[PDB]
Symmetry: D2
């Protein structure tokens, strides 16, 4: 039936959770080109601001429908609608900090609706995250592979620090399409290039966030 | 004294495991200083659970720990302010749990508020296939770091085939008392034994625990401790 | 200066994996600036291997990486001093590898000395049951830390049933060149593709690799 | 006999940690059934160590463990065949150790052969800066898996600033006895306490350990 993902679509996000005991909430509105793999989002901290932790760790928590797929690789996420999908992720930082995320992605007309829950634990008191000594993400590469009827992903991310060092993390994600399994055109092993740029940061409250993404094979 | 010989438990828990939302409510009682407690947990939403309940049991109570050898009770002494804690539990087969908990004191009742998110539990693993049979007793190591109490522990989940499914826990305990008033313990161990006494209708569970905070006693050292 | 368009490889490796001792010797060649190489490996002791050879392949060569976009070659520029590296590889099923490697240059030959210890590979896992079918291409992130070059990567071992067995690699690369003379690169990626050309009688293997150092393109 | 009340220890250890080659030899004695032992360790090569000796300490003895509660001693009952074990130790700051060990019996002497590879210890971390002050006592969990004995433990390294540096150990113990003659124990705990009694000139170390195998008491 009708194709539900358009050249131009918008984003509505609500995210709440707890990082090292600190409760917070934020809302996001954005837009992008799903098939060109580009998107931009404006995030407003609505509760718990100003954040006592670096916003940068929220960034990869704030969008798998906006990925350009090349080489005929099936789009597990775009093809999931109208049902949509959820995903679960644990991100383990090398200094002990850890993030676990549950996300819900649904489609409402021209708007992707994102619902995000986040719990963070054991971020070191004098680490770059809790001290806010971070300076954005390096581009990262995710490996995507099928397992037991759903799509799994793992990636390494490198958080830039204001002392010059990188703070790395390991991500494990399971993506769950709500589509009938037999109706799933599951992709094969492939890569996902993600580049996140925080265009603006204001008053520890307002953040403009840009991402370009591509699903591809090696070279 | 704010903590007495016999006290009661009121718990609310909400979370999502591998995409499945659930809520549960607990009521129980125990002897804080004898390090024993029992709680009745009802799954109020998302029941019957599509996963093994056993992984919720250690999410469902640090005030009921018997402290020996003069080890300060970071949890009992935190009141009336109380405390929070945060924890990530990594299972050897890829599954993971992250928990936030709030512990406060209302008269004779300890109030527990728990939020849980679980990810990447293997579809055919013991947890999602409900092939578990309770926990082995666990030893947590407790040590101070940056003004608060940290804890790490290995947990061994018994499987129905006779095997064990192990996991690694990292927890930060955060007392709400002013740092000036905190009486921080030194490095020590926490023995925890969990027993699920009842399961009824995949919706009602009875859970008992005993716990002791101690130093290493089996292999002694020339200067304490 | 010391690295030319065509060079050879002489490798010696010994180690123990899940209690099984082994030794092997390798001889190969490649084009350092085109980022390609091939090598013939013979299990000289402990053969036939009771484990999948596939896990040894990423242990058997950083001088054969094509560097684009002006990225300084930490490994090629390390000579004549050369370099060492240390790596731990953790498999998702509990198996783990730790490797020490020594790389030196004698005339036209790169000299590789490799030590490996493997622990806790599951008895019925793909590695010990030899149910593996080579590696997916992998991406390593390279970044400077405390005067030397660090590397992390995820690797995915293909299994005969179709599934993947993933692992996490953490590596520190140590140039023997004086710190003041080291031309440290910035954060970048490393694409590695490993193909096992031949695998005979659990003792004789041919191994090909193409590698590229690049930014996010 | 084969394990008597008073036996001796002969150890040889070799390895590399962050690229630094080292060798050390050990001589000691203890009471296997009282779970106590002492040992003198000499750094024979690579001295003085550029890293803290403390991380070598738990690499340097499963025979000297007092078994209470009727726990079968997997290690004592492994002789004359003896046993090996394999271990990976992951520190919270990125450093890692992987060890292969061989334990055999020669008359009144336990013979230990140890291979160690260490990777990615932070340049300014406690280990490489030698800011450690001995180990806290540890608890290992022991459980059977696929015909052999597995172990996991948390170890906490005391640091000079008061903090602790924790690590996670995964070990597989492999008895050389025939599977059919193996008396495998059930899930139990292992209490280990290590004390370094002397440590002259970064080349000589005296090391004491008491150990007990038990249930939860
Ligand atoms: Cl920030
Ligand atoms: Cl159940
Ligand atoms: Cl093979």
């Amino acid at each position: 039936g009708a194709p539900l993902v358009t050249e131009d679509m918008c984003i509505k996000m609500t995210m709440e959770g707890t990082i090292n005991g600190h409760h917070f909430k934020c809302v996001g509105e954005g837009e992008g080109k799903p098939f060109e793999g580009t998107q931009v989002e404006k995030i407003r901290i609505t509760e718990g601001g100003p954040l006592p932790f670096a916003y940068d760790i929220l960034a990869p928590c704030c969008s798998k429908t906006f990925i350009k797929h090349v080489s005929g690789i099936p789009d597990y996420f775009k093809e999931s609608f109208p049902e949509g999908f959820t995903w679960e992720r644990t991100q383990i930082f090398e200094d002990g900090g850890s993030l676990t995320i549950h996300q819900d992605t649904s489609l409402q007309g021209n708007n992707f609706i994102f619902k995000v829950n986040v719990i963070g634990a054991n971020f070191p008191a004098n680490g770059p995250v809790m001290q806010k000594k971070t300076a954005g993400w390096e581009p990262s590469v995710e490996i995507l592979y099928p397992r037991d009827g759903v799509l799994c992903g793992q990636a390494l991310m490198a958080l830039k620090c204001t002392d010059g060092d990188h703070l790395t993390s390991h991500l494990r994600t399971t993506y769950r399409s709500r589509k009938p399994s037999n109706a799933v055109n599951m992709p094969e092993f492939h890569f996902g290039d993600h580049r996140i740029e925080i265009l603006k940061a204001e008053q520890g409250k307002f953040y403009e966030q840009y991402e370009s993404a591509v699903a591809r094979y090696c070279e």
